[PDB]
Amino acid sequence: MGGISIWQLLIIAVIVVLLFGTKKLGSIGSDLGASIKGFKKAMSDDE
Amino acid sequence: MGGISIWQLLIIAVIVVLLFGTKKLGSIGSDLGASIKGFKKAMSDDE
């Protein structure tokens, strides 16, 4: 642990977007994106 | 070799995508993704 933040994570992940022409993020990303709203739907408050 | 840190994991992740031409993520990733919303759909204690 030391200097680890979203900063570096963003840089490499961002390059990934153009690296695969958004083809990857458009297929698996979309499906997992839908899964993200479902997974957090179980663990949430304020209804 | 490698470890269990997000930093190293990201670098390998980032390269893996072009290696399989996004074919793997689009398929196995999606199936695993829709499983992520189901696995956490049960273990929700507001963590």
Residue B26, chain A, CB below 8 Å: the answer is: yes
**Alpha-carbon distance values, A28 to A8, B28, B34 (Å):** 22, 8, 10
A15–B10: do the CB atoms touch at under 8 Å?
no
Distance of CA B18 to the CA centre of its chain: 15
Q: Architecture of domain A1-47 in CATH?
A: Up-down Bundle (1.20)
The structure was resolved experimentally with NMR
A28 neighbors B26 (Cβ within 8 angstroms): yes
**Alpha-carbon distance values, A30 to B2, B16, B33 (Å):** 29, 19, 10
Residue of chain A whose Cα is closest to the Cα of B39 = A39
Cα–Cα dist A25/B10, whole Å: 15
Helix (H) or strand (E) holding A12: helix A6-19
